[PDB]
Nucleic acid binder design. Structure first.
Lengths: 93, 101, 78, 81, 101
DNA sequence: AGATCACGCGCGATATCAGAATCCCGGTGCCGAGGCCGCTCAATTGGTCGTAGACAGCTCTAGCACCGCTTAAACGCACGTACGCGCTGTCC
């Protein structure tokens, strides 16, 4: 059957960061688990934010606030910049 | 001739421990702590207003955290065969708690 | 302003914590620790209030901020 | 299965301490460490078996252990999840 | 008339510290730990099966927890002006962490 | 009796005689990773309808602010005692 994962996307990111660097299967699994964990954290915080504000929808604003809460200082700043730039690119296209 | 009733050092300390573990009122004066909270907040956002209950909640959480920290600090000092808490005791308590790196 | 956390107030907090003897330097260290803790909690609270588009920090924002850090607080409409 | 806690030999605890940066180890440390390990394993396997029972399975899967650890606040990477 | 080459006590301990902080392989033997896991699980449900991955995950989690605990224990032992970790050190580490009551 | 020189003893540093453990260099076989292929399921495109959220107006509650008293509490100062800290020796 089909077991979905983030293997291919993490590999694309890796080859875009270190084109001559591979990743082992165990490291692949660890990275996939990390992506799932951060997804759960951000999504749960966004859900809590929506619930607190009596709001029924998770918008990009909720995800941004969840990122600002979850991540530390510099990581939060850079992640927010990346997210806003990606959303702007998406809206333009 | 005359002599004051000075309690042996460490006795009034025990009396104060008993008095303050038996009570529940907040031990930091309200107004200075409120001013401190406002000053810390003004770094993050300007022209902020605070609900009185918000500052009270901050004070309760802060005092509870400090009391627990001092409990762990006292345990650390006693572990070192001492009776006085010293900054290294707080540092070890925070490091073991996972608070300070 | 941080000095508004007086020496006797830290003495009282230490006593409620069961501390009998307090070193001279414990007061500055405690002021620093309290400042760090308040910085974290108030940063999270202000994040919550900004996300709600409010200029007032409500007790609920503080309660949520504390709950975030694993310091759930009861008695303020949790 | 009887007296398997002693299977965590003295040298194994020594190795674990060394990885922890410990230079000198008291003789009484080994029994205390065995007790601590037993408590930790009891706390984890309890939740793992709870998850297994809820799924109506007779086999404890690695994902049950991962869920238990995540519940206790010890998220583990490298075994799924 | 020759004497063997005995390293001074504490030298091989440091060499072992370096070796085991450099490596990553599990330090507890696998079969004894598996037997312990099954014995502990026998008190919650009988006739249980364990995925090899499940036992490996338990071993990794336990070893990581014990290594972190020993780091905290060493910190407390050094705090007491000692070099040897003692059971009181583990107890203090656990008490400050919040694990032990 | 004091100063200088020579010899002996004690301490520090380097070398060394070794030998021990680690790291490194090379060859080797492996199996784990990267890649290509085929199939299909999940994501994309297009369209609808409905309600969730955005926005404006109004209300009034609560926050801010200010003043003035009073008085609890902080601050300051001093004496001293007992606790921290260093040094030392013994035993395990």
């Amino acid at each position: 059957t089909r077991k979905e994962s983030y293997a291919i996307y993490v590999y694309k990111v890796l080859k875009q960061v270190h084109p001559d660097t591979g990743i082992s299967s165990k490291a692949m699994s660890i990275m996939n688990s990390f992506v799932n964990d951060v997804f759960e954290r951000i999504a749960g915080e966004a859900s809590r934010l929506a619930h607190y504000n009596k709001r029924s929808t998770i918008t990009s604003r909720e995800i941004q606030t969840a990122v600002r809460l979850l991540l530390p200082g510099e990581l939060a700043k850079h992640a927010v910049s990346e997210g806003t730039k990606a959303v702007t690119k998406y809206t333009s296209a | 001739v005359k002599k004051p009733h000075r309690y042996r050092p460490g006795t009034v300390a025990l009396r104060e421990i008993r008095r303050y573990q038996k009570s529940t009122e907040l031990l930091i004066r309200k107004l200075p702590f409120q001013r401190l909270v406002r000053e810390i907040a003004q770094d993050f956002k300007t022209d902020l207003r605070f609900q009185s209950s918000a500052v009270m909640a901050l004070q309760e959480a802060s005092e509870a955290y400090l009391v627990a920290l001092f409990e762990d600090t006292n345990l650390c000092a006693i572990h070192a065969k001492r009776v006085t808490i010293m900054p290294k005791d707080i540092q070890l308590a925070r490091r073991i708690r996972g608070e300070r790196a | 302003n941080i000095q508004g956390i007086t020496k006797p107030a830290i003495r009282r907090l230490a006593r409620r914590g069961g501390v009998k003897r307090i070193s001279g330097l414990i007061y500055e260290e405690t002021r620093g620790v309290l400042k760090v803790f308040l910085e974290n909690v108030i940063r999270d609270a202000v994040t919550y209030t900004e996300h709600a588009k409010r200029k007032t920090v409500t007790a609920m924002d503080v309660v949520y901020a504390l709950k975030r850090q694993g310091r759930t607080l009861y008695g303020f409409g949790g």
